[PDB]
Structures are given as C-alpha cells and as structure tokens.
A paper describes a structure:
However, the reconstructions were still anisotropic due to preferential alignment to the F1-ATPase, so focused refinement using a mask of the Fo region was performed on Sub-state 3A resulting in a detailed map to 3.3 Å resolution of the Fo motor. This map enabled a detailed model of the membrane-embedded a, b and c subunits to be built, which was fitted and refined to all other sub-states. A particularly interesting feature seen in this study are the positions of aArg210 and cAsp61, residues that are known to be essential for proton translocation. Density for these residues was resolved particularly well and suggests them to be in close proximity to each other. Furthermore residues aAsn214, aHis245, aAsn119, and aGlu219, that are also known to be important from mutagenesis studies, form a chain of residues between the aqueous channel and rotation path of cAsp61. A deep funnel-like evagination can be observed on the cytoplasmic side of the membrane that likely facilitates deprotonation of the c-ring near aSer199, which is adjacent to cAsp61. When all the density corresponding to protein had been assigned, tube-like non-protein density likely corresponding to lipid molecules were observed in multiple locations within the membrane bound Fo-motor. The strongest of these densities were observed between residues aI225–aQ234 and a single c subunit, where three of these tubes of density were present on the periplasmic side and one on the cytoplasmic side of the enzyme. This additional density was observed in most of the maps but was clearest in the highest resolution maps, Sub-states 1C and 3A, and the focused Fo map of Sub-state 3A. Without the lipid(s), the interaction surface between subunit a and the c-ring would be limited to three of the ten c subunits, whereas with the lipid-mediated interaction this is increased by an additional c subunit to four.
A key component in the generation of cellular metabolic energy is the F1Fo ATP synthase, a biological rotary motor that converts the proton motive force (pmf) to adenosine tri-phosphate (ATP) in both oxidative phosphorylation and photophosphorylation. The enzyme is comprised of two rotary motors, termed F1 and Fo, that are coupled together by two stalks: a central “rotor” stalk and a peripheral “stator” stalk. The Fo motor spans the membrane and converts the potential energy from the pmf into mechanical rotation of the central rotor that, in turn, drives conformational changes in the catalytic F1 motor subunits to generate ATP from ADP and inorganic phosphate (Pi). Here we have used cryo-Electron Microscopy (cryo-EM) on detergent-solubilized cysteine free [name] ATP synthase13 to probe its structure and understand its rotational dynamics and coupling.
Author numbering:
A (entry chain O), D (entry chain P), E (entry chain I), F (entry chain Q), G (entry chain L), H (entry chain J), ...: 3 to 79
B (entry chain Y): 1 to 50
C (entry chain a): 4 to 269
M (entry chain X): 1 to 47
Write the structure that this text describes.
C-alpha cells in the first residue's frame, strides 16, 4: 500500500519546517547577542546567560515537531 | 547535428575569449610581477647603500 | 556522422574507463557494475597537471637566487608568499605539513579547473580520431572521485591533528559534551558533532565537484544546442565568468583546508 | 488507506507552520530583549518581565495549533 | 472517507497559515515595544497600553481564521 | 463528495493567506508607530490618528479576501 | 462539473497572493511614513500627499489581480 | 473541458506571484523615498524623479507577468 | 491534450518566480540608492551610474528565467 | 506523453527558484555596495572589486541550478 | 514501486528545508559577527569564540534533518 | 517512463531550495563584509579572511543538498 | 556519478605529490625568500 510512504512524507514536511524555524530563530537571536557582546565585552557572561534563557523558548516548539517527526518515521511507519 | 559546425563555433568563441584574456587579464599579472621586481630592486639598493 | 544533439550532449558526459577485472576499456554503451573500473582520463590529467606543477616549482626552487629575481622566479615567489601569508594568518602551530599541503591544494586545483576553459571538443576530437579512444573528458575536478579523494585526504588529516594535539582527553570530550554541556545530552551531542565532523569533508568535495561539473555542463550545452554563428555570444560571457570561479574554488579549497586543520589542532 | 495518512499529513502542516511561527516570532522578540539588556544592564529584570508578557501572547496562538495537531494524530487518527 | 478526511487538511492549512501570521506579527510589534522600553524605562506603562491597543488589531484577522478552522474540524467534519 | 470539499479548501487557502497579509502588515506598521510613541510621547494622539488612517488601507484588501472566504463556505457551500 | 470548483480555487490563490502583497507593501510604506511623521510633525499633510501617491502604485498591480480573481469567481464560474 | 481549469489556474499563479513581486518591491523602494522626503523636504521633486526612474525597472518584469496572465485568460482560455 | 495545459502551468510558475525575484531585488537595491541620494544629492549621477551596473546583474538571472518561460509558452506551446 | 510535460515543470521549478535566489542575494549584496559607495566615493573601485569577488560566490550556486535546468529541459529528452 | 520513488521525493524536501534553514541562520549570525569585527578589530578572537559557540546551536537541528535525509535515501530507498 | 520523471522532480526540489538558501545566506553575510570594508578600508584583507571562514560554514549544508541532487539526476536517473 | 576505484588511485597520487612538495619545493623556496628578507632587515639595521 501507498500509506506507509505518505507517513515518511508527513514526517519530512514536519521536521524540515521545524529545522527552518529552529535555525533562523536562533540565527536572529544569536546575531543580536554577538552585537551586544561586541559593544560590552565585560558583559559576555551576563548576556550569554540571558541568551540561554530565551534560546530555550525558541527551541521549545521546534523540538516538539522534531520529536513527533522521529515518532512517525521510526515508530509508526 | 553537424559536428564540424560545433568545432567552428567553439573556435570563434575561443579566439574572442583569448583576445579578452590577453588585454584584461595579462596586463594586471605582468604589472604585479614588475611591481615586485621594482620593490625588490629598491629594497636591495637601499639595503646595500645603507 | 549520426548525432542528434541530445546524443552529442550524452556522449560528452561519458568518461573513459579501465575494467580491472580484464584491463579492457569499458565501452560507453554498457557499463560494468563493478567498483573496479578506474577512470583513465581524469587520472591522466590529474597526474600530468601535478607533475607540471612540481616541475615548474622545483626548477625555480633549485635555481632560486636572493638577488633581484627573474620574471618567472618572481611569479613563483608571489604564489609562495600568498600561500604562506594565508597560512600564517589562519594557523599558528609548529607543523611542517600545513604550508606545503596548502600550496599543492591551491596550485593543483587551479590547474585542474583551468583545463575546463579550453574548447570542449578539441582534446576529445584528438582522442577519438588520432588515438582512437572510445571517449574522453579532460577536467579532473569535474569528476567526483578526485574531489572526494582530496576531501577524504583532508578528513584523515583532521583526525590525525585532533588526536595528536589532544587525544584520550580532548577528542572524547568534544565528541560527547558539546554543544549542550550536561552529561544527560551525551547521545544527542555525539550525533550532532558526528554529523558536524562528517559535514566538513563531504562539503569540501561536493563544493568543488558541483561547481566544476555544472561549469563543464554549460559548455557542453552551449556547444551542443546552438548553431555555430551564435555560440560565441553566450560562450564568451560564460568563459569570462568561469575565470572568476576557477580561482575562487581553488582558493576556497585551500582556505577551508587550513581553517579545518587549524581549528582541529589548536 | 487515505484516512490515516491524510490525518498525519494535516498534523504535519499544523505543527510545521506552528514551529515556523513560534520560533521566528520569539527569535525577533528575543533579539530586541538582548539588545535592550546590553544597552541597559541595570534593567534585565524589568525588560525580562516585559519580554515574558509579550512572549505569552506570541506563543499562545501557535500553542492552539500544536495542541490541536496532537489531537489530530492521537485522538482522530 | 476522503471528503471529511480532507476537511481536516483544510482546517490545518487555514489555522497554520494564521499561526505564522499572528506569531510573526506580534513578534515584530513586541520587539519595537521592548526597544522603546529600553530607551525610555519610566515610560513602560504608556507604551504597554499602546502595544495592547495595536495587538488587538493584529490578532483580529488571525482569530477569525483560527475560529473558522476550529468550526471546520468540530462542526463541519 | 469532492466538489464541496474543494470549496472548503478554497476558503482555507484564501483566509490563510489573508491572515498572513493582515497580521504581518499591521505588525510592521504598529512597530513603527510604537517607536514614534517612545521617541515623543506627547505626540501619541496625533501619531495614533495617522496610524488608524494607514491601518485602514492595509487592512481593507485582506478584509475583502476574508469576506469572499466566508461567502464560499457559508453561501456557495 | 469539476470546472466550477477549480475556478473557485483559481480565484482563491489569485486573491490570497494579492492580499499578502498589498497588505505587506502598504505596511512597509506606512511604517516609514509614521516614523517620518514622528520626526517632522509639522510636515504630516505633505508626507500624506506623497504617501497617497506611492500607495497608488503599490495597489495598482494587486487591484488588477483582485479584479480578475473576482471576475473569475462571479462571471466565469 | 480540462483546458480551462488548468489555464485559469496558470493565470492565477502568474498574476498572484506578480502581485507579490510588484507590491513588495514598490513598498520597500517607496518607504526609502518617504524617509528621504522627511529627512530633506524641498528635495521632494528631485527624489520623486529618482523614485519614478527606479520604479520603472521594478515594475518592468511584473508587468510582463501581468500582460501574459491577461493573454492566458482572455486569448488562450 | 494535457501537455499544453501543463506547459502553460510551467511557464506561469517560472515567470511568476522570476517576477518576484527581479522586482524585490531591484526594490532593495533601489531603496539603498534613494537614501544615499537623500543624504547628499550632489552624488545622484555617480550613485545612479553604480546602480545601473549592479541592477544589470540583478536582472541577468531572472531574464534567463523569463526567456525560457516565453520559449515554453510560445514555442513548445 | 506525460513524461515531457512533467520534465518541463521540473525545469521550471529549478529555473524559478534559481531566479529568486540570485536576484534577492545580489539585491541585498548590491544595496550594501551602494551605501558603501555613497559613504566612501573615492573607494568605489576598491568596494566594486570586493563586490565582484563575493558576487561570484552568490551567483555560483544559482548557476548550478540553471545549468541542470537547461539540461532537463533541452537535453534529457 | 511507488513507495521507493516517493521516498526520494520525501528526502528531497527534508534536505531542501534543512539547506534554507542552515544557510539563512548562519548568514544572519555571521553577518553580525563580521560587522562587530569591523567595528571592534581588537575583539575578533573573543567574538570569533562566541560565534562558534552560538553557531553550534544553529547547526544542531539542521544536522538532524540532513542526517535523516541521507538515511531515507540510502537505507530505506 | 514513469519512475524517472518523479526522480527529476525530486532533484528539482533539492537544487531549487538549496540555491535559494545558499545565495541569500551568502548575500546577507557578504553585505556585512562590504559594510565593514567601507567603514574601515585598512581592515579589508583581515575582514576578507573572516568572510571566507564564515562563508565556508554558510554554504557547507547547502552543498550536501546540491551534491545529492546531482547524484539523483546523474546516478539514480 | 559513479563512485569508483579512482578514489583510491587519486589518494595515492595526492600523498606522493604532497611529500615531494613538502621536502623539495617548500624548504628551498622559503629559504631563498627569507634569506632576502633578512638581508633587507640588516639593511635597515645599518640605519
């Protein structure tokens, strides 16, 4: 039957779009971290601590999508 | 397809490319080499005269 | 001569090969399925361009005088100074290998790419008519196997320098505890740094292959499809753009090799 | 055939687009937080409490789409 | 049967596209609120009031898209 | 079967793309309003009046796309 | 006949893409008008005059696309 | 027959994508004109002249796509 | 037969994507010209000459795509 | 048969997305050249030299997609 | 047969979206590095170190997607 | 025949999306190189070496996708 | 295109050319260049 391969296609769309969102979201956020670290090079530990707080939120929704993509490819299909 | 025509068209295109390459590409390369020989000649003349 | 232009374009993309089961020549209508079918034409042009690089540089290296240099000597010392300046900025260790490795990579990849500029039928015509060989294509870097062979050479050097500079301590730590630090992430860290490590050589090889293969394919298409009086107008702008690409793709193979070995060792 | 594989494809479109929207929206907002923090290092608690007010609204509408995508896979399919 | 099974895909497209629009729109708008709050920190309750006024407009079209998506899944299909 | 399904899909793509247009356009416009408000806070009632003029234009063309989407679902059925 | 539902789908893509283009185009143009008004508030009727000139050009292509999509939906189908 | 379904859909893609390209291109170019007009009034006729030169190039490819979309609907279908 | 209907669809997608690329590429490039002119209008002829150099490269790939789109539509038909 | 028209569609997708990539990448790169040329008008030839060095890299990947698009369209069949 | 063929299409969407995500994310992050390095040339080894830390996170999700794309083509094929 | 056409449409997705990703990623990065070269022209060789270091990362992931697209067309055919 | 025993055949060629370039080409060229740079630097030392 065809079905088992439209499960691979469903996981592929879900995991690819989650990789777009995770990579661009951290790219934008990290660029503004480096701009702050260039201006204030004695504040790198403070700015890096805040960056890890907000970066965890950026990753949180893409990590759900990537986990469900792995479930569909390995466990269901 | 005429194979001999494709050889003729490739020859015309190579001659036009070689005329571009000689005038634009070779004068920058020869000018860089002569600039090095000038800078070394001045540097050795200054070093040996000092 | 029966050529439909689609068939001419097809034949131009076929290599000359040696069947090591028999030492026969793999005629280009039935390819043997074995992995022992060496490509003769990329092998011959790869070693002959490597020999020509070493003959020119050794000829100057054996003569070279520290007075005012000759005009040819000045050209070779310019490329020695450009490679050493690149290495000395990017790498700071004691190694005797990185500088000559970067010289051979830059000058040999430049020479291999420079074969692509020559007219697409001229050497294949001479090989078909005068030597009688069933096929030929003359750009080594356009073929995958040479660029993956150089990229795997740099992979084996990336492993050698990372083990030698930091061994039982450093390589196991960087594979297991990065980027996420805590030991709970070790399985994820091992996958992400494994694929990061493997991405450095595979992208070196595919970068160089993809640019030279599409560069040659445009000259095969422009020669194949367009009538003689009209080829030169599209061909000359493509040749002029490709002079920029051959020097950039040779320089980027040198730069990324130095950067990956510098980042591995230091 | 079609019922299950189309429900997994629909869930993949909801969670893929929610991962695009949530990750880029929080990435942009977090970039302006980290530049504000580098500009006013006495105000990280004031700017991070404003950031959590704004971030709740940004995440809320993607979280409808993620929760309903999970309903589509687990409870319809 | 394919008519209702594709109605779940129709809702998935409609609310997924609304979720990228709403999350990026509020992300940009909130970023300019946080930059204003960092430049004039005694001004935050006035700027937050204005952020809530314009955030209601930004949400108004996505919220009817999400509401019609939920209707398509629950009431039509 | 499929004719009535494809009408609901046509409304889903029409309102989804209209929700992106409306939310992004007002998100950008509202961000530049909020920076004008933070730079000159005594000027806010004037800038808010100009914002409502410009926002009415931005929102008007998505609103005919939404109105036709509801016509396709409710009236054409 | 399949011809009817494909004509409603063709109108839906034509008007959806026109609503994205026209709403984001006027959103960017209006944002630069509102920061110009915040900088030079005695010039606002002059900048309105230029904004309405430029807005006519931005709308001219999307209003053709809406006019033809609405013709396809009402007159051709 | 099938010809009209696919020809109206082909025009709808061509004119919808041209409406994105034209509206975003003139929106970006026009916003930079309006910041120039706020920065230097009394240069408005000179900057408007340069804006109309550049606008002619921005419109030129989208106007080919509009003219061929009108040909596909009115002459081919 | 279907071949012609898909060839009009192929020409339409190729020219739509070329129209987006060419119009937004010249819109970004021209926006940076207009702000460089507004700062110091003594450089308008110099910057306009460099604009025409750069704009030639921006147009060069989209015109390959338009030339092939016209060939598909008229000559492959 | 179906073979040829789907090969012309696959070529149209390579050629269109290459026209997006080349036109937007050189538009961004050229905008930063023109603002540098306005900033340092004695250094236009130095900045133009570096512009052609990076423009070769931006054009290189789209030219791979153009070369293979012409091979699929003309030479494969 | 069709299962094997569609698995090459499914890998193609995973690797295309992983390529866009990685290249745009690192391009934004690296641009902010190369502008910090030009403004503060004594800080380059510090900004370079922080760039390589942040870039490892940007790489992390695209490497999951591309590694699974290679698995789908070569292993299940 | 049927298996080969879909394989040419799979390669067209890989190479089109990787051409967009790599061209715009290098365009953003190269624009920041040209900005830094206009601000401090004496740094232009140093910033050139930093550009080539970061550019090797930016187009590393897209080159895996370009190379496998070339494999699919020429080897899998 | 086909991955092939050429990958090994090129790997032998590359390592031979790197060893010949490393010993024979690089030390005599860099000795000659640095010998001139030292003689110019001692020419500045006269000042």
């Amino acid at each position: 039957n065809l079905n088992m391969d439209l499960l691979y296609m469903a996981a592929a769309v879900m995991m690819g779009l989650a990789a777009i969102g995770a990579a661009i979201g951290i790219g934008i956020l990290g660029g503004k971290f480096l701009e702050g670290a260039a201006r204030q090079p004695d504040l790198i530990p403070l700015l890096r601590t805040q960056f890890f707080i907000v970066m965890g939120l950026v990753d949180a929704i893409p990590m759900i999508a990537v986990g469900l993509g792995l479930y569909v490819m390995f466990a269901v299909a | 397809m005429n194979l001999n025509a494709t050889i003729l068209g490739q020859a015309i295109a190579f001659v036009l490319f070689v005329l571009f390459c000689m005038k634009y590409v070779w004068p920058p390369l020869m000018a860089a080499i002569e600039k090095r020989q000038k800078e070394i000649a001045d540097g050795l003349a200054s070093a040996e005269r000092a | 001569e029966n050529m439909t232009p689609q068939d001419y374009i097809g034949h131009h993309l076929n290599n000359l090969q040696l069947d090591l089961r028999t030492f026969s020549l793999v005629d280009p209508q039935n390819p043997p399925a074995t992995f022992w079918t060496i490509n003769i034409d990329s092998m011959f042009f790869s070693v002959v361009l490597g020999l020509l690089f070493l003959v020119l540089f050794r000829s100057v290296a054996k003569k070279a005088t520290s007075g005012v240099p000759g005009k040819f000597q000045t050209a070779i010392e310019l490329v020695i100074g450009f490679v050493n300046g690149s290495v000395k900025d990017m790498y700071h260790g004691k190694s005797k290998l990185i500088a000559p490795l970067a010289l051979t990579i830059f000058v040999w990849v430049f020479l291999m790419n420079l074969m692509d500029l020559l007219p697409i039928d001229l050497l294949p015509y001479i090989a078909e008519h005068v030597l009688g060989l069933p096929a030929l294509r003359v750009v080594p870097s356009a073929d995958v196997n040479v660029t993956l062979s150089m990229a795997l050479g740099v992979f084996i050097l990336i492993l050698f320098y990372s083990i030698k500079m930091k061994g039982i301590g450093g390589f196991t730590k960087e594979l297991t505890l990065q980027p996420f630090n805590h030991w709970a992430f070790i399985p994820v860290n091992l996958i992400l740094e494994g694929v990061s490590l493997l991405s450095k050589p595979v992208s070196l090889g595919l970068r160089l292959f993809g640019n030279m293969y599409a560069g040659e394919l445009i000259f095969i298409l422009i020669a194949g499809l367009l009538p003689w009086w009209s080829q030169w107008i599209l061909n000359v702008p493509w040749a002029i753009f490709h002079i920029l690409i051959i020097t950039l793709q040779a320089f980027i193979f040198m730069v990324l090799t130095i950067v990956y070995l510098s980042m591995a060792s230091e």
